[PDB]
Nucleic acid binder design. Sequence first.
RNA 1: UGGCACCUCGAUGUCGGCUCGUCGCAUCCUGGGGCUGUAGUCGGUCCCAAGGGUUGGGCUGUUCGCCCAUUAAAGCGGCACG
RNA 2: AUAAACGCUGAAAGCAUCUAAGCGUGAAGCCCCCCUCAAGAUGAGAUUUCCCAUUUCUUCGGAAAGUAAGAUCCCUGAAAG
Lengths: 171, 206, 59, 143, 36
Amino acid sequence: GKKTIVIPAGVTVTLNGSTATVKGPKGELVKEFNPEITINIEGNEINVSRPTDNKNHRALHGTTRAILNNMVVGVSEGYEKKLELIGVGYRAQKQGDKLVLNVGYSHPVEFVAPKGVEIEVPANTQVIVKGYNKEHVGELAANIRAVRPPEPYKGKGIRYEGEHVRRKEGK
Amino acid sequence: TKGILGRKVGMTQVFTENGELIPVTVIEAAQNVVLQKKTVETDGYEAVQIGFEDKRAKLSNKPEQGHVAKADTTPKRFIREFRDVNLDEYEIGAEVKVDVFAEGDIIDATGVSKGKGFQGVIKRHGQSRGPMAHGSRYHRRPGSMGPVAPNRVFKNKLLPGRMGGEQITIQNLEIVKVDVEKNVLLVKGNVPGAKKALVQIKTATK
Amino acid sequence: WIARINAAARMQDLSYSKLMHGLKLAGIDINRKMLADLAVNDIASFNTLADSAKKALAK
Amino acid sequence: RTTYMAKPGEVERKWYVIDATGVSLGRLSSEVASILRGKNKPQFTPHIDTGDFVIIINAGKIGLTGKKATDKIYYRHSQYPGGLKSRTAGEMRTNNPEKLLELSIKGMLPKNSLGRQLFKKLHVYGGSEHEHAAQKPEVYELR
Amino acid sequence: MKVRPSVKPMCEKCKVIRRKGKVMVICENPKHKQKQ
RNA sequence: UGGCACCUCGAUGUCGGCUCGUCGCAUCCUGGGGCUGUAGUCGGUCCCAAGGGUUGGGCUGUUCGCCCAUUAAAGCGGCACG
RNA sequence: AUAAACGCUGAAAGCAUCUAAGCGUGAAGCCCCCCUCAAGAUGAGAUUUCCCAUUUCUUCGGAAAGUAAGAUCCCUGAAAG
Ligand SMILES: [Mg+2]
Ligand SMILES: [Mg+2]
Ligand SMILES: [Mg+2]
Ligand SMILES: [Mg+2]
Ligand SMILES: [Mg+2]
Ligand SMILES: [Mg+2]
Ligand SMILES: [Mg+2]
Ligand SMILES: [Mg+2]
Ligand SMILES: [Mg+2]
Ligand SMILES: [Mg+2]
Ligand SMILES: [Mg+2]
Ligand SMILES: [Mg+2]
Ligand SMILES: [Zn+2]
């Protein structure tokens, strides 16, 4: 909030009341806002304003700049979330678009790419999620990891790249 | 889905291919005719009207002569409606035959139960008797009618009354044999009602 | 009578509490029974009384 | 002596259209409950119906300040043992906006035989179009 | 999670926050999680 | 378990069992979850949850209790100790 | 659609945080799905079809008196009582 952002090449911004949209090479995004912030338009250093400066305005000041920063950078580079698989017999195929996981259950589990987020599986023990929406990309990775969270004894289960998995020593 | 109207004829048994023996119910389903189609624009709901048995012109009166004259058919005795059924079929005045069903289909039977008169608690509601000896004088009575505090007796305190005659439906009931020359349809099991009673057959809802 | 003077007084950008204060502050001693009679039958004169009430309030 | 009393049919009863978007539920109902009563006419008579007819449009945009959209509960009992049922005010506004405004106003009217008569004088529509254009109503601005 | 009317930190790594209008303690050690 | 003696002495029937139930949740079983001295099986404790379910006999007038045999479980209380 | 619970993005507070704005999962429980009653729901609903605009009196509300479509009294009965 109160900081500035830079429009990249190919990115367009139009505004309508509390509604804004961004068109870019990756795709297009749309969102609503609260009218009480009065987004500041510039040549490139778009920001917002705080007409009142009270408790419920400093909180709303920072979020608007941060998410528009996310929206603008989303169509320029994209967002990536990486996952790994630990445990013998834990290994995943890819049947076209559907994502198939063999995590020791008696049945396989199926996953489908949502609207505008793409799943790729480079190695059988690794999974990558990419898309032009940080909120959507983060949620999809959480659902995949939620199948079997890392158990604390042997590290078995899906995990991120930096989960400091708490470890115990049973028996 | 699909549906017809019929008359309960009786009960008997048949032998299957595997050798087992099962009881069946016999249904007479002659003279079904589609009389009227109800649309959302005209009525707000989708339905088809079926008439089952013709009857003598003396018994029919003037207002219902003109209702069936639109479909070009003789006056009928039973008229009912079927919902949640496709309307691309069912041209007005078309006959409805038993062969719309097949071997091993699953249907639902709806009818009116047999009538019993003024019945007591232990037959109507299946309650318990008091002791019949040991000096008691409580044999077939309702029971306590509630606590003292409310100064009244609550609702649904089950009590005597007229027992039968309500509409009952039985689900997931299989079909054994279908005959088109006799308009006879065999259902494995029991259906509510006495002999000669109307029975409404429809495809299973679940 | 009070509920009828109130309904008639609101049509002239006033209220009962702020109208009955104007009359006393101006010296008019007409009671409620007569005031309500004008508000229903001869509403033309009721406005003349209400105008004097507004003058007393301002000055 | 001589105090004027109205008679049934002597007072002309009008029709009013009230737009109810953004107004609080109880602030709207309080003013409407006195239009139907007849408390804005010098011809007021306590024992005679002398009010106006009211049409309410946009009943789905009514206001509910605070946590009333979830913490306000409407109860119903069917007089069978253990038959108490409840609905929140938030979903009632979403699904049945006409029932929410009728329940609010009905409790603001006298609880007698003539109070039921004034209730039948009220038409509430959740949308923005009313079926009473043949009566030629006017637009009433809330004070 | 320990649900008691006397939530307070136990170690040096404990933290006090507020979610959904109530006081709770979250810590790296799962035995230290408390809620009021 | 008690204290008081406010209605009832021109009558408010008092234990246990039978028939019939209905309500509260401080939950016995089943449903979801946090922590564990949670490796697995079996458990312990706490949070949400009242939808349904919650045994047949021997001894005693017995409520209760002890015992035999089962069950997913053999819940605690209010309704003039219904 | 939710409870407890677990999360995503995210600021107040340039970091962090499930919360403050916004989203995602999530109970034999809530509303539905299933079965039955239900327009006296005096807010008395809808559809298809049938009969039609007679005669005496009126000064006025309107009154009566033969009918139409239709029903009943009366009689033979049970699948009903
Ligand atoms: Mg019928
Ligand atoms: Mg006897
Ligand atoms: Mg006495
Ligand atoms: Mg509890
Ligand atoms: Mg459990
Ligand atoms: Mg546990
Ligand atoms: Mg229960
Ligand atoms: Mg013996
Ligand atoms: Mg006691
Ligand atoms: Mg007792
Ligand atoms: Mg009707
Ligand atoms: Mg016979
Ligand atoms: Zn700690």
